[PDB]
């Protein structure tokens, strides 16, 4: 309710090319208020799940969660003048292996995790 999506290019299997404007999917929020528009646009943006390519959803929520914007005190110079470590490991090792295990026997496929008695 209240959200529109101009779709077209984004799906599972999609091929994203650096020849063109980077537009995955244009989104438009509707509300009977301009401060529910913001949460109706906040909500959808936080609901997206795109795997394969990055996006500016973190920056897109960021502007509409910002004190200057949310109440209309803003201009056209507004923007111009405005765990992880652990996922880094995981990512690194999932892509490249650990050096101590890389070329040695792996565990059985197929093995029960240790349970503390």
């Amino acid at each position: 309710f209240g959200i529109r999506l101009d779709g077209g290019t984004s799906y599972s299997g999609a091929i994203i090319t650096r020849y063109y404007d980077p537009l995955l999917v244009k989104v438009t929020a509707w509300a009977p208020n301009p401060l529910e528009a913001i949460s109706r646009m906040d909500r959808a943006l936080r609901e997206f799940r795109i795997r394969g390519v990055a996006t500016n959803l973190t920056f897109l929520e960021a502007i509409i969660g910002h004190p200057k914007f949310r109440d209309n005190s803003y201009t056209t110079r507004f923007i111009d003048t405005t765990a992880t470590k652990l996922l880094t490991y995981l990512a690194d090792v999932t892509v490249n292996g650990h050096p101590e295990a890389k070329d040695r026997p792996k565990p059985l496929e197929n093995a029960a995790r240790p349970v503390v008695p």
Partner: protein, 516 residues
């Protein structure tokens, strides 16, 4: 790497005969040693898959380097049908080859009374016939056992062995803890009485077959003292190192007076095999009962096995070292390999810990029975399914629970393995056996005596050639398995002559092979 061969216990047996040979063992100060590498060693660690090729070639070194050895356990057990069924090779030709390689040592087979090499139960005359050929074939020392310790079921075999003028070593299977007042059924009198009965039955030697490596050192001290006070025959001790303390038990036993002990070359010892031979000899070295085996040679030979063992990588098990769970479940060493890899093949690789507890329970439910091949199997099967069907023991014996009991359980409970002294538990069996009627006499004694001339005719017509007494013996033990080997032989020539890598893997490209 010498000269001609020092006379050994082989010459000694030929001159004394089995009876006076045994009294010699009894009278000897030095402990005597049987190497089990050629039979039990690879049975327990490599699924009995070791080949004649590797085994024949080491007979002559044994012959020259270790002439003080009491015997080479090198035949019987699983090797009889495995060789044929899986290795495509004649175990009579294996036996012949070791016989000509080591004309100075005793050659030892494990024999299961009732059934010999026995996948089942055979008329007496078939057991009799088998032992005769085994004595022709090269065997001097038969260690005969009965999977329930039912002496009655060993009289046939013992008489045959004696008849052939060969060593009859009657074995008492060890189970439980003689020092645990809690489990009174398998106490010290149990074993000592058995010793005396085995003596009256005509044994030249008594063996203690600790098939699961359950003897503990404190008990070895009690037991072997007791046995030697109870019978004047020599005592021979067999065990497995599943607890990773069998070497202690062996050493305890030696101090205690035991007359002979088994061990395996170092490269195939430990875990479910026997305790390490090199290291038991080194521990004894310089003591009053010093066996006088040359540890430099033990090492050399061990190294040869080690190499040999690398060839059989595929039959190596996932077992990683000492397991004191053995006291809980009691699975024999020659049946700790097959079973947990059968349990993989069933979709129960992660739940082999539970299995163990029921295999313990089962035992108790059948009434706490000796568990050695084949009783041991029958027992595996119950836990296998008490877990596959997620059943408990009142559930296994439940009027409102349709359990489809394994064949083997059906069979043992009926009478085919014989009788434990307490008999079988009525209700389980009454339910187990499903209207089919049980018996309580010696299975041997109900069987029609085999028409040998006829049966011979069946097989001879079938191969379309005459067969040898030996080959015929093989057929009586394993008709189907022998038939197949016979025909696989007619197609492939003497593949036993091939080096192990070529046998299992043929040839690489450009690769060259000398084959005799």
């Amino acid at each position: 790497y010498g000269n001609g061969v020092k006379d050994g216990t082989k010459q000694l047996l030929d001159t004394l005969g089995p009876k006076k040979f045994g009294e010699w063992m009894r009278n000897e100060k030095r402990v005597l040693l049987t190497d089990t590498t050629m039979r039990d060693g690879h049975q327990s660690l490599l699924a009995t898959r070791m080949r004649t090729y590797d085994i024949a070639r080491i007979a002559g070194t044994y012959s020259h380097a270790l002439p003080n050895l009491l015997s080479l356990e090198c035949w019987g057990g699983a090797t009889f049908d495995v060789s044929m069924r899986f290795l495509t090779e004649d175990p009579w030709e294996r036996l012949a080859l070791i016989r000509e390689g080591a004309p100075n040592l005793l050659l030892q087979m494990l024999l299961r009374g009732a059934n010999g090499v026995g996948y089942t139960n055979y008329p007496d005359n078939v057991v009799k016939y088998f032992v005769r050929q085994a004595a022709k074939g090269g065997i001097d020392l038969f260690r005969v056992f009965d999977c329930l310790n039912w002496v009655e079921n060993m009289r046939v075999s013992m008489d045959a062995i004696a008849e052939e003028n060969k060593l009859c070593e009657a074995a008492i299977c060890y189970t439980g803890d003689i020092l645990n007042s809690a489990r009174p059924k398998y106490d010290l009198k149990y074993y000592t009485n058995l010793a005396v009965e085995l003596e009256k039955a005509g044994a030249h030697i008594i063996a203690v077959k600790d098939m699961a490596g359950l003897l503990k050192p404190a008990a070895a001290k009690v037991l072997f003292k007791a046995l030697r006070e109870a019978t004047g025959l020599p005592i021979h001790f067999h065990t497995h190192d599943t607890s990773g303390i069998a070497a202690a038990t062996v050493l305890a036993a030696v101090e205690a007076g035991v007359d002979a002990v088994d061990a395996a070359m170092d490269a195939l010892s430990g875990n479910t095999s026997q305790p390490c031979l090199g290291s038991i000899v080194e521990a004894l070295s310089g003591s009053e009962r010093d066996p006088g085996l040359d540890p430099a040679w033990i090492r050399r030979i061990s190294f040869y096995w080690e190499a040999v063992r690398n060839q059989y990588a595929a039959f190596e098990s996932d077992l990683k070292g000492p397991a004191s769970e053995v006291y809980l479940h009691e699975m024999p060493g020659g049946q700790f390999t097959n079973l947990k890899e059968q349990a993989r093949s069933l979709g129960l690789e992660t739940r082999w810990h539970q299995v163990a507890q029921a295999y313990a329970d089962a035992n108790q439910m059948f009434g706490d029975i000796v568990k050695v091949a084949p009783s041991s199997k029958v027992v595996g099967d119950m836990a296998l399914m008490m877990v596959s069907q997620d059943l408990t023991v009142a559930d296994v014996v439940s009027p409102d629970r349709e359990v489809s009991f394994p064949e083997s359980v059906v069979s043992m409970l009926k009478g085919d393995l014989g009788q434990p002294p307490s008999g079988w538990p009525e209700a389980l069996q009454k339910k187990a056996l499903k209207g089919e009627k049980p018996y309580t006499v010696r299975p041997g004694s109900l069987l029609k005596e085999a028409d040998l001339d006829a049966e011979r005719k069946v097989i001879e017509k079938k191969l379309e050639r005459e067969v040898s007494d030996f080959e015929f013996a093989s057929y009586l033990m394993y008709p189907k398995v022998f038939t197949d080997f016979a025909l696989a032989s007619d197609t492939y020539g003497p593949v036993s002559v091939l080096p192990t890598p070529a046998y299992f893997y043929g040839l690489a490209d450009g690769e060259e092979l000398f084959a005799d």
